[PDB]
């Protein structure tokens, strides 16, 4: 099939924080990209090109460490270096909540309906019921280093977390009659696990990717614990996304090519490489229609690749 070698758009990302553990971009279901640039969050509306500076941190030294849109795309969660998880109403351009519970920066976020999960440099994960006064309703403690990858499954049955302690934990959706203990703890990656993404068409299938000392993409069945595939990507794997339309995966990388790689699933054959970034890719996010992948990189650009469409 034909995949374009050039991105559809190249957006300037001046002062993007070149910190591997942060999750600074997210594309909403309303087709709006949220981009954290140092101490500000900018919103770019894909259909119009309109840009809004949603917010700016008020204290010296403060920076944004994560952003995640709620499913409906009307609220944006913003994790900060000052251990805050802010909830912003983007229609009103106003902060609704400034939730404190963490002891260190919140570099990862993931929503499950009205529950927002947040991962911290402390290694703890907190569940926040954003609708209520005492938002902090659960603490999941399965990491000894920064939680850099955090992702609820699309069916809400599991939550995956990856850390700078080289672990992947798969958590249940509720503590039930027992406590908050992982259903699975995968120790096979020999590096930080920032890349965490669930297969959209198979409930229990998860893809994870390790850092520079690991370089592998691993596919798991979280029910059986099976490692279905382990492929060497020859670089750190910052992100992974699945195309639900093409049955493919796309991963972002660092040294030496700073490229995106498209893989055919389930064969894991290399389909294409998207080159152009001049410094390591930091994060990937997908458009709500599944056609475009935005890659944010340490070269201060956001490249938007229409790699899953011909129109």
């Amino acid at each position: 099939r034909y995949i374009p070698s050039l991105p559809d758009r190249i957006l300037d990302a001046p002062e993007i924080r070149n910190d591997y553990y942060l999750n600074l971009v997210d594309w909403s279901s309303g087709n709006v990209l949220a981009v954290a640039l140092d101490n500000s969050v900018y919103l770019w509306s894909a259909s119009s090109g309109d840009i809004l500076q949603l917010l700016q941190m008020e204290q010296p030294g403060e920076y944004i460490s994560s952003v995640a849109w709620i499913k409906e795309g009307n609220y944006l969660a913003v994790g900060t270096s000052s251990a805050e998880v802010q909830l912003w109403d983007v229609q009103q351009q106003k902060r609704l909540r400034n939730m404190t519970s963490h002891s260190a920066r919140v570099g990862s976020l993931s929503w499950n309906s009205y529950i927002l999960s947040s991962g911290s440099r402390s290694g703890h994960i907190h569940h926040h019921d954003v609708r209520v006064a005492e938002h902090h309703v659960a603490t999941l403690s399965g990491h000894s280093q920064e939680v850099c990858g955090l992702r609820w499954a699309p069916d809400g049955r599991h939550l995956a977390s990856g850390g700078n302690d080289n672990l992947v934990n798969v958590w249940p959706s509720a503590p039930g009659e027992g406590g908050w203990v992982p259903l699975q703890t995968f120790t096979q990656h020999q590096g930080a696990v920032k890349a965490v993404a669930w297969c959209p068409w198979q409930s229990n299938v998860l893809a994870t990717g390790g850092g520079t000392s690991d370089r592998h993409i691993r596919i798991w069945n979280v029910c059986s614990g099976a490692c279905l595939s382990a492929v060497d990507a020859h670089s750190q794997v910052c992100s992974i996304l699945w195309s639900p339309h093409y049955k493919e995966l796309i991963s972002g990388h660092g040294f030496a090519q700073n490229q995106l790689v498209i893989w055919k699933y389930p064969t894991m054959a290399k389909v294409a490489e998207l080159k152009g970034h001049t410094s390591r890719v930091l994060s990937l996010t997908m458009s709500p229609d599944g056609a475009t992948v935005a890659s944010a990189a340490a070269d201060e650009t956001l490249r938007l690749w229409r790699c899953f469409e011909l129109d």
Binding site: D12, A13, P14
Partner: peptide, 6 residues
């Protein structure tokens, strides 16, 4: 340098 500009 304008943030998010083309």
């Amino acid at each position: 340098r304008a943030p998010x500009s083309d």
